[PDB]
Amino acid sequence: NRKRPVPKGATYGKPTNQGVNELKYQRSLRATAEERVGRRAANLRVLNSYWVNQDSTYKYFEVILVDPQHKAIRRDARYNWICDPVHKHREARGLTATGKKSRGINKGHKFNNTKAGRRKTWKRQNTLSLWRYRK
Amino acid sequence: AKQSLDVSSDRRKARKAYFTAPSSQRRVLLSAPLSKELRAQYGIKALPIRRDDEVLVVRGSKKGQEGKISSVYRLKFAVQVDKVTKEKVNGASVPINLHPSKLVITKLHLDKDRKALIQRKGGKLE
Amino acid sequence: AISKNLPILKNHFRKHWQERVKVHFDQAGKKVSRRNARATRAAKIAPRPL
Amino acid sequence: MKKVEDGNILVFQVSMKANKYQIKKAVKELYEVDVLKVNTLVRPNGTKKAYVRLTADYDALDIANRIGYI
Amino acid sequence: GKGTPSFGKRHNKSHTLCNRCGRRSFHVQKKTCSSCGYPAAKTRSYNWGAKAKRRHTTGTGRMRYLKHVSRRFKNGFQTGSASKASA
Amino acid sequence: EKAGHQTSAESWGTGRAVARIPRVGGGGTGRSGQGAFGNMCRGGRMFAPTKTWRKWNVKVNHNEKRYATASAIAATAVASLVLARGHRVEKIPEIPLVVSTDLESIQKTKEAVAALKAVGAHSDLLKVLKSKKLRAGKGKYRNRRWTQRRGPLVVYAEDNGIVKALRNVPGVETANVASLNLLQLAPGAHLGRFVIWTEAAFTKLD
Amino acid sequence: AGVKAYELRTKSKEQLASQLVDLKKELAELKVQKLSRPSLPKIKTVRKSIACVLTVINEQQREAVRQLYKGKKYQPKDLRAKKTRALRRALTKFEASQVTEKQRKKQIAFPQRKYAIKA
Amino acid sequence: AAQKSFRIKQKMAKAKKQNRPLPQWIRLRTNNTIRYNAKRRNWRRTKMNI
RNA sequence: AUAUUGGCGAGAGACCGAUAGCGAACAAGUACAGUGAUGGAAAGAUGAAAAGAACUUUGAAAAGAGAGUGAAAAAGUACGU
RNA sequence: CGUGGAGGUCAGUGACGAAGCCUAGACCGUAAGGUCGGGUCGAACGGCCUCUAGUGCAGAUCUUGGUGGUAGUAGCAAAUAUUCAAAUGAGAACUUUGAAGACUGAAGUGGGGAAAGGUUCCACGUCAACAGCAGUUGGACGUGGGUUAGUCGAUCCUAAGAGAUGGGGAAGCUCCGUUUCAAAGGCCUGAUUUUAUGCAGGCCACCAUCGAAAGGGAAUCCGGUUAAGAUUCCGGAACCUGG
RNA sequence: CUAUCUAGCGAAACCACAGCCAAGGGAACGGGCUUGGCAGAAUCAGCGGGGAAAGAAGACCCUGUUGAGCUUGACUCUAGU
RNA sequence: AAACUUUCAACAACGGAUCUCUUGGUUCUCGCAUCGAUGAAGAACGCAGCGAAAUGCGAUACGUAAUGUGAAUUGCAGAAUUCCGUGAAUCAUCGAAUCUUUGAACGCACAUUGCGCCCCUUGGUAUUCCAGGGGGCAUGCCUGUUUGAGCGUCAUUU
Numbered sequence A: 001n002r003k004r005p006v007p008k009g010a011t012y013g014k015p016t017n018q019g020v021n022e023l024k025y026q027r028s029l030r031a032t033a034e035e036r037v038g039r040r041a042a043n044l045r046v047l048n049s050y051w052v053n054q055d056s057t058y059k060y061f062e063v064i065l066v067d068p069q070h071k072a073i074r075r076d077a078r079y080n081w082i083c084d085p086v087h088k089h090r091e092a093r094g095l096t097a098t099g100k101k102s103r104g105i106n107k108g109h110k111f112n113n114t115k116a117g118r119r120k121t122w123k124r125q126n127t128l129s130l131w132r133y134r135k
Numbered sequence B: 001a002k003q004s005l006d007v008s009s010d011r012r013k014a015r016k017a018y019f020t021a022p023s024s025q026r027r028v029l030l031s032a033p034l035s036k037e038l039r040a041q042y043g044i045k046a047l048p049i050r051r052d053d054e055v056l057v058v059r060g061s062k063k064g065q066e067g068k069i070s071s072v073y074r075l076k077f078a079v080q081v082d083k084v085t086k087e088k089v090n091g092a093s094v095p096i097n098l099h100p101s102k103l104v105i106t107k108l109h110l111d112k113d114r115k116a117l118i119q120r121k122g123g124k125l126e
Numbered sequence C: 001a002i003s004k005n006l007p008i009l010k011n012h013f014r015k016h017w018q019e020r021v022k023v024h025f026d027q028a029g030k031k032v033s034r035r036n037a038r039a040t041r042a043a044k045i046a047p048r049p050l
Numbered sequence D: 001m002k003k004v005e006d007g008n009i010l011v012f013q014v015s016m017k018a019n020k021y022q023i024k025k026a027v028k029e030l031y032e033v034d035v036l037k038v039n040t041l042v043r044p045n046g047t048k049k050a051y052v053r054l055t056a057d058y059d060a061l062d063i064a065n066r067i068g069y070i
Numbered sequence E: 001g002k003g004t005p006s007f008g009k010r011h012n013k014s015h016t017l018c019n020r021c022g023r024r025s026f027h028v029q030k031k032t033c034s035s036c037g038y039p040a041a042k043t044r045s046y047n048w049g050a051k052a053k054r055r056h057t058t059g060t061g062r063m064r065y066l067k068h069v070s071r072r073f074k075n076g077f078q079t080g081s082a083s084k085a086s087a
Numbered sequence F: 001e002k003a004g005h006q007t008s009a010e011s012w013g014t015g016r017a018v019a020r021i022p023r024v025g026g027g028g029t030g031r032s033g034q035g036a037f038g039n040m041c042r043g044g045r046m047f048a049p050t051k052t053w054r055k056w057n058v059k060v061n062h063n064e065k066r067y068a069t070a071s072a073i074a075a076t077a078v079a080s081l082v083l084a085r086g087h088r089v090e091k092i093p094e095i096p097l098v099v100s101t102d103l104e105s106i107q108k109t110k111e112a113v114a115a116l117k118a119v120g121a122h123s124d125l126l127k128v129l130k131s132k133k134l135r136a137g138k139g140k141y142r143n144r145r146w147t148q149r150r151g152p153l154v155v156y157a158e159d160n161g162i163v164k165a166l167r168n169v170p171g172v173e174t175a176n177v178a179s180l181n182l183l184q185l186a187p188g189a190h191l192g193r194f195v196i197w198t199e200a201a202f203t204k205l206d
Numbered sequence G: 001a002g003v004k005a006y007e008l009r010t011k012s013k014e015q016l017a018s019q020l021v022d023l024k025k026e027l028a029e030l031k032v033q034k035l036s037r038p039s040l041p042k043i044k045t046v047r048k049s050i051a052c053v054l055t056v057i058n059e060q061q062r063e064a065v066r067q068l069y070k071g072k073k074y075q076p077k078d079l080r081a082k083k084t085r086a087l088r089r090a091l092t093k094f095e096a097s098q099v100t101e102k103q104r105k106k107q108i109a110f111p112q113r114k115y116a117i118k119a
Numbered sequence H: 001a002a003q004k005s006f007r008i009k010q011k012m013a014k015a016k017k018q019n020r021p022l023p024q025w026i027r028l029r030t031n032n033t034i035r036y037n038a039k040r041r042n043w044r045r046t047k048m049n050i
Numbered sequence I: 001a002u003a004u005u006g007g008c009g010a011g012a013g014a015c016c017g018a019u020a021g022c023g024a025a026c027a028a029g030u031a032c033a034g035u036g037a038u039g040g041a042a043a044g045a046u047g048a049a050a051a052g053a054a055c056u057u058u059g060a061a062a063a064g065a066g067a068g069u070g071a072a073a074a075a076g077u078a079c080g081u
Numbered sequence J: 001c002g003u004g005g006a007g008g009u010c011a012g013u014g015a016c017g018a019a020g021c022c023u024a025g026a027c028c029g030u031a032a033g034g035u036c037g038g039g040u041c042g043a044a045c046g047g048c049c050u051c052u053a054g055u056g057c058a059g060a061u062c063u064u065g066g067u068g069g070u071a072g073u074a075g076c077a078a079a080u081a082u083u084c085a086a087a088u089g090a091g092a093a094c095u096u097u098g099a100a101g102a103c104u105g106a107a108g109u110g111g112g113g114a115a116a117g118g119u120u121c122c123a124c125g126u127c128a129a130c131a132g133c134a135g136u137u138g139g140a141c142g143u144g145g146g147u148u149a150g151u152c153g154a155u156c157c158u159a160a161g162a163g164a165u166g167g168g169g170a171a172g173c174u175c176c177g178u179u180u181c182a183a184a185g186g187c188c189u190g191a192u193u194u195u196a197u198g199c200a201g202g203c204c205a206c207c208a209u210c211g212a213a214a215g216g217g218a219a220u221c222c223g224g225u226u227a228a229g230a231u232u233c234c235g236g237a238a239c240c241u242g243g
Numbered sequence K: 001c002u003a004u005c006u007a008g009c010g011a012a013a014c015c016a017c018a019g020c021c022a023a024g025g026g027a028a029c030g031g032g033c034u035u036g037g038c039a040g041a042a043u044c045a046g047c048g049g050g051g052a053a054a055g056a057a058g059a060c061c062c063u064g065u066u067g068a069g070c071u072u073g074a075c076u077c078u079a080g081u
Numbered sequence L: 001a002a003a004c005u006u007u008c009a010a011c012a013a014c015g016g017a018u019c020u021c022u023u024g025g026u027u028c029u030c031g032c033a034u035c036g037a038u039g040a041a042g043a044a045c046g047c048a049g050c051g052a053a054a055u056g057c058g059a060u061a062c063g064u065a066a067u068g069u070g071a072a073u074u075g076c077a078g079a080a081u082u083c084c085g086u087g088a089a090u091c092a093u094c095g096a097a098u099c100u101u102u103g104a105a106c107g108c109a110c111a112u113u114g115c116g117c118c119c120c121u122u123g124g125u126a127u128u129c130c131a132g133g134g135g136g137c138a139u140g141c142c143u144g145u146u147u148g149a150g151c152g153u154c155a156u157u158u
């Protein structure tokens, strides 16, 4: 779990917010996995990652990264999409396959809240649209 | 009426633009109309005034005075005439400042580049 | 507070709504854009239909 | 000036970035003179002044007004 | 004692000149800067401080380099030199 | 939306013999101490600051807008109204004033002006010319410096040079019958524009 | 007035070398004079001649290097283009242009057709 | 301080060269507004704060 | 096709008119305060043109009185009303 | 009734004087107000039909500015104390010189420094402001000058402690840890005299760094000199360190 | 040594408007109102009766569906264990 | 009767309202996509004949090169003839350079203008010591080169 990093369990506020210990990170371990090796090989681009083992204390992932300035990738079609500046640190914006998951991105009724992007969709439904000739 | 989406009928920007115009556009703004004599000679209405031009004053208290331009005092929008001056109480001379829109040019200081400009303007030729 | 014989309104403005007002002053502008785009697409679309 | 007239010393404003070696060398070459020692200080206006005493084979006053001041 | 006579004891410095920003805001013992945050590689700033931000953002200095980038773009990051006509 | 509020001011609360308006803190400058935010305060926010989301455009039922423009067209044929609106048609043959469709084809201001003049409009055209005035107010510096009366309104059915020909004679405006504007037929909301119709336009009317 | 870039571009590495040292001596003297004369403007004209030479000496050397690197794969970073940090990292046109082999075939057999409606 | 760092003395030197009246001929310049050196400082009126 | 109180280039307003309008129309995020984070002003207008008052006289001087400039000094760098 | 701005209209008023302001002058209106004369002024402005609001003040211990009575008033009384003359000056209780009278009394009102200031130091000129009387005086104003090192400090060392690095936590800003669960070096010199050089010997190493102008620590003294520097310059006489 | 008087220098507090009483009535203790006593320029040093004098929107008290510091087998939770 | 107080007026003070101005603000709209290890943004100290600031610049220091324009700049001084010209300019443009001390900031440090290491080169007899000039030594990561480690492990010489 994520222990609420507050000083002595002290929360300063309403009781609904007074929790410290059954609290869970909205992103997955696998994402924490991706994000750290990505910071370490910042010259690489994170393509994907997969589980490989765990014990009581650790989950273990192998992360797959690709070198955007190596000419085998830049000359390859198929992959040179990843050389584009828009895929800089995709795993830090949750665009790797783990990211898209946790982020609630899928078609259908079960993803209304969340999937044009949660925050963006909220913003839409809370915007007062005013025309020149008011309706 | 303007028609262009690229000109501004705006009083503010017009004033800013005049008042902060750099020496080179200021040259063009300080242009003067040729005399009728000179206008028939090169088929052309006006030119950017220059130093060593001969000149008639056609407006204001110095009307009728004539002379050579001594300097184009760009940073002042003004022109001074080797011969048109104020004599102070202490006998000292001091140039009068004249605007070339209030002059009329009577002898151009011609010059290879001067001629070329007249030609460029649709002026006579020779 | 509730008074007089009036309908019960539900005007949802308890929320900082002023930070998200969208007044479409660009109504006329966007239209001129939409058309100028339609124009030039058709242009480079040779005699194709859009 | 008195230092020139009475102490066999040439006085110079000199690069802030200089040093007693670098100064002695330049003096030794721009003026074709030999040098006894250089003292320096950083003047309070932020420039460095260098007292260069010449060896006794040279008269600073002579070479002062060769350079062309007095 | 807590005022005037105790003020006379004020003669040591908590902060000096910061190498990075040049305010007298560099805390001697903490060896860090209360304005700019040096020596952290990041620069200190906060969104609760619009004014402080405005006091130090880009364009409040010389833009030695940046100030020339858009003209450069305007001409397509030209290489080479200008030709000369004749007349 | 920020004006008046770019300060960390606070009330001093009562007990200091001094109003409880928020005051700017710190010292060493004239402004520490001074009333802050708040509309009787020099430099504070205005009362009920103006918002862009004010309603600017007003809708009018299309049928009614039309009704208006209709009425305004009828009014241009009543001399007494056209006169009261200050158009100088005190001479002029008859009204509606109709003019051959050659007008639509004139190309040149001088000839357009000569044309209008002959058809009786010399006088109104003058009116405009002798009416240019420096605007009274302060809009004089908001891109509205001069003020003049309103000349005749020339309507046509096809544009073959009459529009550009007339676009520089002070006071005069041009209009296609196919369109036709209430703001032009009833200026200031006053009925009775001086209208000159080309034949073409006139029969297009129904 | 002083020197002119063009008159200097015709000279050897070593004449400009000496040109400078004389210009240096020049200003060297004027400074001695600047301080007993109540203003010395001649100096700004030599301060600049100095710049001009340095500029042109420097022009020469850069070309030199640029020449003995012509056609070579690795130029000094100095003399590479400059453009922008981003633009420098973008795919070459070749790289970008790259189309997979399966796509090549498709493009060759089913391109956008020109066409027009009426009959 | 007496034993003073070079950085401090540097700042001190600059701070001293700035300490002069307005050069009188500026007043003669065309369209000149500057009447006096308004940013002027004194050791007994305002400290340098290093 | 959508977003855009940032950046670059532009056209506008039934907006404000120097206690207003941005805090800043000015050498303004300045001067100044605070160990620090931060706080943060006041302040535009002689005249078309300096023609910014030669000269005389009183005074230690600043200045006054004359004279003079100017359409005006009931405009004198304390300056429009 | 009155105000900022907007559409329309009087082809409205105006440098032969707009607006504004002053006026126990005039006239209209129950009134909100309007109108006129005279004076002052200098560039724009108004009536009527409409439109529009950031539209009307006596107050809010209202905001900002400006001004009074208070009042030539309270005051300018701690720290023993001043006086005569001359000089200078437009001017002298207050400056300088001389004389007198006194005080601080070496636990100093003497002679140096540390923090702190930053040019206040010295010279020339010099009084509008400032020094709560004065001023010819000044730590003030203007213009200049001035700080000289192998040996005095920093610099080196380590102290409380601060803190990178293999790493381990943490969504993360970063937190922990400092020899720590780490493959963590570099000192001699032979070989080789293709060469000053790669190498053949080999020992020793739980080991970043910052942290003292009072701690630790290589080495300088006396005389002379300036308007202002001096264990720093001069003269003379030494010492330490590296080579 | 002050105060005092002089030359120079020169604040602040406070101020609805003001400043002679007796009685009356009156928000039940008036400088003003009502009826009477009376009533003469301009002032100086003192003084502490009065100006329910002046200094912080009353310290005490109560009200408010206003708090905070603190305590506890009040209510509802929580780091930890 | 003065003086004093109060009222009104004229002239003169004090103060900055009013009116008129406006290279500024504010709001709408349209077009565009460009920061940085090729060292950004930001900081410090400097640079002018005569500058404290603002603005601009970097020891090539209110700028050098180049291109256009075609005679200024201007407070004063001063040039220079270059004014039928590869050419004024406190001009515009800008494609070539310069770009101190720093800053993510990169040899180590940094209340220090503190302290190393390496290559080239120049002086002082010098491979080693000193001084001068030039060029270098951060970290994570990727692909590759080279040189290596482990009875992890294969095959072999015999």
Ligand SMILES: [Zn+2]
Pocket (backbone or CB within 6 Å): E018, E019, E020, E021, E022, E023, E025, E026, E033, E034, E035, E036, E037, E038
């Ligand atoms: Zn800092």
